[PDB]
Amino acid sequence: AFTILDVRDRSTYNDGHIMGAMAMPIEDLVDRASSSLEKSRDIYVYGAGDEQTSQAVNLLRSAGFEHVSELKGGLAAWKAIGGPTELEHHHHHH
């Protein structure tokens, strides 16, 4: 149906992301999406805040993706409606 892209820092993605969302940080977004997804695919993106989200949507649309929409409120808005999330294995040297 549609693909979900998390454009936040990969470190952030690891701490929790929308279940099934793909990790595609802003800096590598156009490259990865261009090589992994067809431009006719319905894409839904969320980042850390409205600003970063908008930036990502504009980058994808300018790259030729025909259907790119924003998930308003991002991860917080998603958890607010009881949506599923996943955390990734990683460690901290802190």
Residues at the annotated binding site for Mn(2+)?
A: 15, 27, 86
Nearer to Mn ion, 76 or 81 (CB): 76
Show the site string, 1-40: x = touches Mn ion by CB under 5 A, - = not.
--------------x-------------------------
Residue ranges with strand state E in the chain: 3-6, 17-18, 22-23, 43-46, 68-70, 85-86
Cβ of residue 40: shortest distance to Mn ion, in angstroms?
35
The Cα 42–Cα 52 span in angstroms is 19
Site for Mn ion in 37-76 (CB under 5 A): none
Q: How far apart are CA 45 and CA 3, in angstroms?
A: 8
Q: Binding site: what residues are annotated?
A: 15, 27, 86
88 binds Mn ion (CB under 5 A): no
